[PDB]
């Protein structure tokens, strides 16, 4: 759809973007540990909590990528975890919300990253991979087509990004290398190339630099469609003493928002952040969305 004024609607901003653009090229905001918005326990928040509002709030705020880490339970279901902490949220809960939103705004899609956060409970019937694929992935909202997935094929569906290895069912982005606390580049599907900046638990300076460096690489390689650029703005650390993901995000979000705001880039990549809200001054997510005007 024409008109750039349509990227300002946070619920339907993916409508104006042509059905032809591979999802890879689109600058899309996301959320890290999207299911940590339920922890209201103090000592749990300074460590675990990275979000303050529900999936629907996150989605209504332009986010279209979710960082979902779960665990296989005794009752043979997948629930959301953060290391050893149960998040009082489930996979079914995420999927329902994703469907409702996708039902109110069919011109959109949602990429769901699925990572096996904690070890299966001692008593599970099946494996983490099979449990998800046989009781969940088999649901019709999930796009089962692979390759460099375009926007047209994904509208109304849920695109999956496999962070688990034991997969057996076709669909979404296959599982790739992904090293611990690093910045790297591998190959995804047949064509798709991928660069990921996931330096969680690092110094404020080293972090901020990395976000910018990878962000610089992407805005320079803006016309490369067969290249996924994932940029995590999240800085996990042994908080408590104002080292919490809330403190870091309190600075990183506005800062990075401005970095894009002043550079007027054509592409920024997939920017996964913490504390998506209306608190911080420039708004990281709103800027990331605007950097797509080069597609309208």
Curated annotation (Swiss-Prot):
SUPFAM superfamilies from the entry? PLC-like phosphodiesterases
User: Might you name a Gene Ontology BP term for this protein?
Assistant: lipid catabolic process
Name listed for the protein in its UniProt record: 1-phosphatidylinositol phosphodiesterase
Q: Which GO terms describe its cellular component?
A: extracellular region
Is the keyword NAD assigned to this protein?
no
User: What positions does the domain PI-PLC X-box occupy?
Assistant: 22-163
User: What's the catalysed reaction?
Assistant: a 1,2-diacyl-sn-glycero-3-phospho-(1D-myo-inositol) = 1D-myo-inositol 1,2-cyclic phosphate + a 1,2-diacyl-sn-glycerol
Q: Which organism is it from?
A: Bacillus cereus
